[PDB]
Amino acid sequence: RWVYLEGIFTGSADIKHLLPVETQRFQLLGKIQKALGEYLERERSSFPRFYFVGDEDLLEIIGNSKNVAKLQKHFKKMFAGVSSIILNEDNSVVLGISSREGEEVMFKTPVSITEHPKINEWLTLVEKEMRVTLAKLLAESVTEVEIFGKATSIDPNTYITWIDKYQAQLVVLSAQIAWSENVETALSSMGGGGDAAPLHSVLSNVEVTLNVLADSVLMEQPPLRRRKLEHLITELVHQRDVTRSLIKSKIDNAKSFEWLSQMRFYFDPKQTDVLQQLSIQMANAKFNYGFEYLGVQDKLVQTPLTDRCYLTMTQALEARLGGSPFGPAGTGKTESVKALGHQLGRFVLVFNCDETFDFQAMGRIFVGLCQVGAWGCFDEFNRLEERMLSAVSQQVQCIQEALREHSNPITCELLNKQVKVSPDMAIFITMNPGYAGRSNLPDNLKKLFRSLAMTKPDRQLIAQVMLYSQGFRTAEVLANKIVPFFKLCDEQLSSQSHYDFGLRALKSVLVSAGNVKRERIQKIKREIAENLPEQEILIQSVCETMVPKLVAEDIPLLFSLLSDVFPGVQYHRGEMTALREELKKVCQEMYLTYGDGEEVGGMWVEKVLQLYQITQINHGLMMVGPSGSGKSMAWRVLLKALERLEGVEGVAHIIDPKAISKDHLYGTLDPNTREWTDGLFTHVLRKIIDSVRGELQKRQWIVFDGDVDPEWVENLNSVLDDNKLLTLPNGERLSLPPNVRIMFEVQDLKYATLATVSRCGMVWFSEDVLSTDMIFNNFLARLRSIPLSPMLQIQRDAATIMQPYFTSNGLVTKALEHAFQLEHIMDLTRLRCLGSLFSMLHQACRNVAQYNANHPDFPMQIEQLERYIQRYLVYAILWSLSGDSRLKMRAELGEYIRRITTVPLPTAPNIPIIDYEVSISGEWSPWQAKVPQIEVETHKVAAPDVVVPTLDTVRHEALLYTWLAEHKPLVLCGPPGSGKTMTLFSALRALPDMEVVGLNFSSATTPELLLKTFDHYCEYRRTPNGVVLAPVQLGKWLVLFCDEINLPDMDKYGTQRVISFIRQMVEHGGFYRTSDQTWVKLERIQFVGACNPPTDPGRKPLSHRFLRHVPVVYVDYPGPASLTQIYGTFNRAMLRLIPSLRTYAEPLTAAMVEFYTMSQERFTQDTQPHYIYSPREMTRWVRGIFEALRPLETLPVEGLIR
């Protein structure tokens, strides 16, 4: 209320001067607010395109009357192709229109802002003058093309001069109008009965003009003229096909349906001063070409399917309906709708509609489309919630029925007000039936549109025409080779989630082939000449696009197919020497292995190079592969190498999309105030677009590392296709700058629709890409550097000690490949084991450092350190590769390690090695020496903090202390009540500088629990060179004990939001606060989780992307003898208040344990959900008997059993 008006009053200077009376009247709120709203509405009524503008920018536009240079940012959204206005020297008279591609359109009569100071007045004048100037230039170009249209053997010079003189859309119109008049005249002349055909003359004229164009495109041209020739060649090939068909079918009359069904043009220049000179008619429709400047748009090949689409869409445009094409993904529905819209010269606004598009949003959009008379193509209209699909049916029907009064001002009912409806507007909806995340339309709405099925586009024709326009002399043979190649790849190769052999892939191959041809021409010219091997260029582009996504088994299949379709053709990949040396250097500064060919690290460098190629071609990427494959390192290395090679600073924004609600990822708009607040992705994109800090000159990489499901990805469908635009429910449109790449670092695409898979370039990272010894080399290289100076010296000689074991076929590799054959409570992934092993080896080095500190004289020499490290290696291998399995599997792994290795090992012949620790003197010491026969006080038995030492207790506590010293997150998984919380708290009570905070995870837990915990226990939010979240208690480390970590429910696409949040804030060390979108970095925060086995009811297996950073320790139920000792201790403790029951302390415990065993095998969780029997019951048993016995002084054994 008050704040909004105060903010908007200060946005401009002259606005305070405007309406000066109310300035003191405000500084009665309802009347002022409604007066301002009515001012904005009547201003939008004066210039209808203001309805495309929001108030926050309309106020600027009206206020910035004097500074016209400010207006040159709002024109990109008020118009279709207009980008800037060409003004006079004093910026008082606008002289013309400038497209974003640099194609001026100079007004015949300039608008002088001096005599039309009001913004709406001269904006309307410039719109009208743009229409008039386009009409007049089209008339002149039509006359010019009529001069040499009726002739043969056109000289290329005059034709090229005409092409360069006039605008691209005007050129295309000129050629089609001339052809339409020629064919009308020929069929009229032969309409007086069957006679000789002057139609052959028109066919020959088209053929010779096409030959001229093909030769003109063989030689190098300026890029703008190259695009003009592209358009003309596509068009005239279409005209040639049409005329050839007419001659074949022997049409004699201008009224035959073989000619009426063709889309025809009629220019009547003597029309008296209106934009209605040009009339475009198909079978029975009749549209007046709207003179909207479209800059230079990319024309489509007019295939028979596109002709059917034109027929149906024009038929639906007649009778004031709407067009509703549908089909699989990537069949040209959106682009065909846009092609028709620009063909008639219509302002076409594309919207990508998601469920956030509601009744009010669609109503405001329709207000805009009606006031301006602009088309609307609502891509994915079935992604709205079916309630809103029903609700907006009322609005669509209101528009259509009110629009039919024109065929009979005219106004309709939209959002409880009357708006002017123009006949020019249309409504189109493109849909994907049967795809995930899609709603089902009401039958009320399906009758408001005309559906059209677009299932099999004519790909052969598209390939032939595109290659022919690109200058390939063998375009027909190339198309006949390439399209069957794709249909056979779709059949011979295995169907994968990331596999795409549709139309989008073929179009990408064709564009890359054209670029490769141009580059090869330039290279030859550095060293006419049109004997290039064109098939080699095709294989070049195909291997640059279809191979990066190939799985190991489908690579030989694709290459056999290439060898059988293009026999005798050889492919020779480039060397990329400069980028390769830059990559080698960067891999040196990041402790990463570099390789070439078959060397160690080869397949990885091939992967990063393929990634660079796909980055060059595409603007949406997906790095797909099992976790632990080097995707993140690949893209980071490439970003640094490109920064140091090309010299452009590379900035990356990593976002986890599933770690936040898409209301926070894209933003929202409150229903009441109708004010839009940005999300996370939108804020990044707006900062890039509004490059206040020069963000447009850098390499911006927005990476989405997370999970892909058709709920938030589809909001970027309009961003990953040729549109390159992000559409918001606010109606704002954000254009993707050319320096921005969008990538998705994902591990699979099982839950992604084909719609998003086709829009992105797939690079497949196998697990063989990142080999084991490559990780070992990284570990050792980081060890010999990066001090955890005497510390570094210990690290260096320890790494020297460990070297012979970390071999490609050494101890660790064989141990790990054998441990893959064991049974683990959680899925066993290589990186989890390796990470636990590396953290414990770091702890071993820290132990050596601590020892050397404890002996200022006589530090540990090379021999003692050698023995200690080479024994701690075996200890840590056993713990890492079997710390999540039962005792039998741990024993089996120990037996295998004893069988293979030559490290000195304990000599006891019948006990497992896991019972043995390594002392600082490098000797195998039994764990049994560390467990004494404790004597608990006769009080405080079964107390919360009392832990009776046990083998499995000391081993597990030592392991947990090792892991928690390096602040590494970890998880304890086991049956309920087995001692996870007890063991963890015992471990932490040894660490004096850590405070633990408990968190209880239910099925309905969201990252909000974590955020509240941080808001309470970490209330400092500091802002040094960034923002850091730190615990309030200085000098202490906050531990978050997250119990039942695998409990929160998976959504429909297999993602747990809080697990993704934790994984993000552990691996990337922080998160995003959805209040400022600023990255917040964790300081002194670590996590420990406790869970039950995934096999348990209500328990979900955790994601491997999460399991990499957290090793898992399996705490099982104490066995019979373990319980016997644990509770005999408590019994002997409590059976002391009455010194006559002493001899009963031993049977009683046994009795207790005996009963427990029976119950645990009688009433399982199979019978009832609550039949879980745990040592918590024995603890309650002892504590209960103790409470009973505490006050009494004497008691017979009968009372004890009672």
């Binding site: 029903s390 009320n444 059209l452 006949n480 030989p556 059988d564 399982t1164």
Partner: protein, 751 residues
């Protein structure tokens, strides 16, 4: 009956009529209650019989013999077995077109039964022998109880205005429930316009529709108007609130509230009870289609242009009827369940109107050969009814119908709308000039509609009719530990499925061969699923012995396995929807045994034995990969390229197996409605016919247009025609029409 059936589906009309007939029968004068026979009619299939089923003179099938020996239990039919084998005309009667019209007298009665007694006895005989006609006999039964023309108002178009002005009180809302693909809002918009009654229509949703609808109801009940709430099944809570609100309004008369909804089980029950239910459904039969199409189109709109316009609409209507009633035969007819709706007919009429106005500027008596046939045969094949068509086989079907109807030679006198409609009778084109003549021609249509009217074969509804009859009887009858079992099931399955199959050896020469690459991929996938299925069943066995515990996966697997649902884990190759676990397991055993035979053949020989084996296309994970691999093999064996290759198929029933160097054998293909006496097809009345050892040859393409007698038959994986493998070119025999092949839904099935 009329008021109830106006709110029921056509399928349940016969059940309700049979119940009403029972009520009338029990209230008659002195005829027997006939409960002893109705008991056998309803629950006579549950009689347990071990080894008494014996066909006589091989004149009966197993099901027929079982049914007759079950029906022999009744006192009247104690002599069925002797009587059927003592009569020769019974064989003729069994294979008759409409046996229910004339049923032989086989029961023995001491007294001459009343006509209702004969009706029910013939009902039992029809149920025993020819259950396909059972439903068609059931109608006859009702005809003898409630009198014929009892179930006849339903065939007529619905009369909204009479019921709304008469049979509906203001308080009771008018519920209009539409099946998937239908809507009723247009009917009421037309009704309100015709009655000159102002109607306020609102779509329910978005929380503004609620406020607007409440305001509209409030103003309408005190003034007298019509209110529509469209698609009001997306706000069930507000719908409860509306049901509560209507009960206490006491509105002005002439007020009406119409609630348009889809048939979904989440509609409130109390609202259904407090309203008047009208079910809108695709018409039954072409006759009802035509009648309601004509009733929809105003008579003023017909015969405004020259009189030939009247005929156009008629053809149009007839055309629409066909493409509305081929949908009820979705596998054989329209291969996909298209939503050919009333908007299609409205748009077709609009285009016909506009183009016939343009072709003849008012002048009457336009020439039959001067009407713009082209402007309609293509706007309705490429823009109106072809707009919904996905594949090209349905498109060629639509084009066949259009080119056979919308032609100049339809204003003749001997033009035949349909052929072999009664096996020999041809539906003749009516010779009318005015609309009323065509309406009368429609109303005299015989009630012997068969799928042969639609172009489909006459046996395209046998399964559907039997299922309908069984459903009727089940509805009538309804209206009147697992651990041991799973252990036995899983043990039997594990015995049934063979053990794991051996892989294929990788040699230096085998790796290049495309056939070997495909076969290795198949054997590897088969071994992977074989290990998984076998160990899953072994885990279930151990769980059902009590030895092994319960896992979340084991829980899900067992839960969906006792119910007969095929587990999502096992489904990795394409299977028809609704496949049971038992059929799936038999199929899996067949596929694994085929892969085992392949593995032994490959072990015996690497190159000379992977091409001389006959591969079952039905029992193959990816048969498209096999086709591509064979093509690639022929391309590599010679200098030919992949693109310059085409398929020629030759059926070799002799099993001589004289395979050429470019020929691959395939077994297990099934023609749907044609036989191959040679490599030439021929239309037949059998549902499917096995093709033994079709040879596939890859020959270099000549880019020559095929002959007239050659037809392009799709090949699908299974009966669910939802996936194309490839297409075959079969030459047809002499005196055959490829259009008849297209209409009769001839195809080839792998499974």
């Amino acid at each position: 009956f009329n008021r109830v059936a106006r709110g029921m589906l056509h399928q349940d009309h016969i059940t309700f009529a049979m119940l009403l007939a029972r009520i009338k029968l029990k209230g008659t004068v002195g005829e027997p209650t006939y409960d002893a026979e109705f008991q056998h009619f309803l629950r006579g299939n549950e009689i347990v019989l071990s080894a008494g089923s014996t066909p006589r003179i091989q004149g009966l099938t197993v099901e027929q013999a079982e049914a007759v020996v079950r029906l022999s239990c009744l006192p009247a039919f104690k002599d069925l077995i002797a009587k059927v084998q003592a009569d020769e005309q019974f064989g003729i009667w069994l294979d008759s077109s409409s046996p229910e019209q004339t049923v032989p007298y086989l029961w023995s009665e001491e007294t001459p039964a009343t006509p209702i007694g004969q009706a029910i006895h013939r009902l039992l005989l029809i149920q025993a022998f020819r259950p396909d006609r059972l439903l068609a006999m059931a109608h006859m039964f009702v005809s003898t109880n409630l009198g014929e023309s009892f179930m006849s108002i339903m065939e007529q178009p619905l009369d909204l205005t009479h019921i709304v002005g008469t049979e509906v009180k203001p308080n009771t809302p008018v519920l209009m429930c539409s099946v998937p693909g239908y809507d009723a809002s247009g009917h009421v918009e037309d009704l309100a316009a015709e009655q000159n009654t102002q109607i306020t229509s609102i779509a329910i949703g978005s929380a503004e529709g609620f406020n607007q609808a409440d305001k509209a109801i409030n103003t309408a009940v005190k003034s007298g108007r019509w209110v529509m709430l469209k698609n009001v099944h997306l706000a069930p809570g507000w719908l409860m609130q509306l049901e509560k609100k209507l009960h206490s309004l006491q509105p002005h008369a002439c007020f009406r509230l119409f609630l348009t909804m889809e048939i979904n089980p989440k509609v409130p029950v109390n609202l259904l009870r407090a309203g008047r239910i009208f079910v809108f459904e695709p018409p039954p039969g072409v006759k009802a289609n035509m009648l309601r199409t004509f009733s929809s189109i105003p008579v003023s709109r017909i015969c405004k242009s020259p009189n030939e316009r009247a005929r156009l609409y008629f053809l149009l209507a007839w055309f629409h009827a066909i493409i509305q009633e081929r949908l009820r035969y979705a596998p054989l007819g329209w291969s996909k369940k298209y939503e050919f709706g009333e908007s299609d007919l409205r748009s077709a009429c609009d285009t016909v109107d506009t183009w016939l106005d343009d072709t003849a500027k008012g002048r009457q008596n336009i020439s039959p050969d001067k009407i713009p046939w082209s402007a309609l045969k293509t706007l309705m094949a490429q823009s109106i009814y072809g707009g919904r068509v996905d594949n090209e086989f349905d498109q060629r079907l639509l084009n066949t119908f259009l080119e056979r109807l919308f032609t100049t030679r339809s204003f003749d006198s001997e033009f035949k709308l349909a052929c072999k409609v009664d096996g020999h009778k041809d539906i003749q084109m009516p010779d009318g000039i005015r609309r009323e003549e065509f309406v009368q021609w429609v109303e005299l249509l015989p009630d012997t509609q068969t799928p042969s009217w639609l172009g489909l074969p006459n046996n395209a509804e046998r399964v559907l009719l039997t299922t309908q009859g069984v459903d009727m009887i089940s509805k009538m009858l309804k209206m009147q530990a697992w651990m041991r079992t799973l252990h036995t099931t899983a043990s039997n399955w594990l015995h049934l499925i063979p053990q794991t199959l051996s892989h294929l050896k990788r040699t230096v020469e085998n790796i290049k061969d495309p056939l070997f690459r495909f076969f290795e991929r198949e054997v590897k996938m088969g071994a992977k699923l074989l290990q998984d299925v076998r160990q899953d069943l072994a885990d279930v066995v151990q769980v059902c012995e009590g030895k092994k515990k319960q896992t979340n996966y084991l829980r899900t697997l067992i839960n969906e396995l006792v119910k007969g649902i095929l587990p999502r884990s096992w489904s990795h190759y394409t299977v028809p929807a609704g496949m049971t676990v038992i059929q799936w397991v038999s199929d899996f055993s067949e596929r694994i045994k085929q892969l085992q035979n392949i593995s032994l053949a490959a072990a015996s020989g690497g190159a000379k034995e992977l091409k001389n084996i006959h591969v079952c296309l039905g029992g193959l994970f990816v048969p498209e990969a096999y086709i591509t691999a064979t093509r690639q093999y022929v391309a590599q064996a010679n200098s030919w390229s992949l693109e310059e290759l085409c398929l020629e198929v030759n059926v070799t029933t002799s099993q001589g197996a004289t395979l050429d160097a470019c020929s691959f054998g395939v077994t297990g293909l099934k023609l749907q409605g044609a036989t191959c006496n040679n490599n030439k097809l021929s239309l037949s009345n059998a549902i499917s016919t096995a093709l033994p050892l079709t040879q596939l040859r890859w020959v270099k393409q000549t880019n020559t247009e095929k002959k007239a007698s050659v037809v392009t038959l799709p090949v699908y994986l299974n009966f669910t025609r939802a996936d194309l493998i490839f297409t075959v070119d079969f030459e047809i025999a002499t005196k055959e029409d490829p259009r008849s092949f297209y209409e009769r839904g001839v195809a080839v099935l792998c499974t």
